[PDB]
Swiss-Prot record:
Changing D49N: Affects binding of catecholamines, and produces an uncoupling between the receptor and stimulatory G proteins. It is found in: Cell membrane; Early endosome; Golgi apparatus. It comes from Homo sapiens. Disulfide bonds join C76-C161, C154-C160. Binds NHERF1 and GPRASP1. Interacts with ARRB1 and ARRB2. Interacts with SRC. Interacts with USP20 and USP33. Interacts with VHL; the interaction, which is increased on hydroxylation of ADRB2, ubiquitinates ADRB2 leading to its degradation. Interacts with EGLN3; the interaction hydroxylates ADRB2 facilitating VHL-E3 ligase-mediated ubiquitination. Interacts (via PDZ-binding motif) with SNX27 (via PDZ domain); the interaction is required when endocytosed to prevent degradation in lysosomes and promote recycling to the plasma membrane. Interacts with CNIH4. Interacts with ARRDC3. (S)-timolol binds at D83, T88, N234, N253, Y257. The chain holds residues 31 to 340 of 413 of the full protein. GO terms for biological process: adenylate cyclase-activating adrenergic receptor signaling pathway; adenylate cyclase-modulating G protein-coupled receptor signaling pathway; adrenergic receptor signaling pathway; AMPA selective glutamate receptor signaling pathway; bone resorption; brown fat cell differentiation; cell surface receptor signaling pathway; cellular response to amyloid-beta. Belongs to the G-protein coupled receptor 1 family. Adrenergic receptor subfamily. ADRB2 sub-subfamily. Residues 29-41, 100-120 are cytoplasmic. The modification Phosphotyrosine is found at Y111. The keyword Ribonucleoprotein does not apply. This is Beta-2 adrenergic receptor.
Amino acid sequence: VWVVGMGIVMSLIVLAIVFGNVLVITAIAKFERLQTVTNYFITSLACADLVMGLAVVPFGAAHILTKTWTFGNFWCEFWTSIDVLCVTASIETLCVIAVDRYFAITSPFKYQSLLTKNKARVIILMVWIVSGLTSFLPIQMHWYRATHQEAINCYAEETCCDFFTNQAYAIASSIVSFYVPLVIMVFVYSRVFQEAKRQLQKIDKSEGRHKALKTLGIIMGTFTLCWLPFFIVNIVHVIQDNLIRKEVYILLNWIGYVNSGFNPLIYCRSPDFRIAFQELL
Ligand SMILES: CN[C@@H]1CCc2c(ccc(O)c2O)[C@H]1O
């Protein structure tokens, strides 16, 4: 009396993610005015989220629902690699956008000289290649496989494949994916908020007759609430053998996936985007 209900929520999540990302992608391609040098990063993030919603989630829901990985044994290694790729690429693209904002605010005159049209392609390719090296190469040739007797059967068994990692791959993946981008974004947005406050205070000197806090709160709260617990539990269950159950890990991992669906609403609400959305439909 519970199988049908949860599948409805899963289908709504999948449909929402796919619809949002497809609309965001088609908006930029359709209209010339929406195109911008900075908007290519949004295109990359939208592509990553669309790939996640097209591949990772629908297959991962079947494992939860039917409780049997009825697909082939070779496929789920590819599935895990795709999941890691789709997480790392999105997080690093968000970090790139934050750094772009810092350059835009803290250096007006020199902003054009630093960033040009062609540099965006190089940055995107570097981000995606770094995402590829951390996921496909270790997963496919099996550095990550654990040595303890448990789960060796599941690696051998065709019906089973669950994530199990040594004490090194978890640390390396967590450091590459989460902590460094978090530090970079924190410092960048701290400086941006300081500059905005300085200007807001300066105006009141010559005008003798809030918004930044709200927007920064939204941007940091969404990302931190989405992704902070997952990497903490990822580190902790590997530092000590038994402190975390599997169900909690699965729940936190699935909560982490909803972020890719919220990105279009967070980052695409400018008047030009609204006009484009109205024009499309
Ligand atoms: C199947 N779930 C995986 C497991 C570990 C992991 C994920 C995402 C990014 C990483 O850097 C990871 O190490 C999760 O999506």
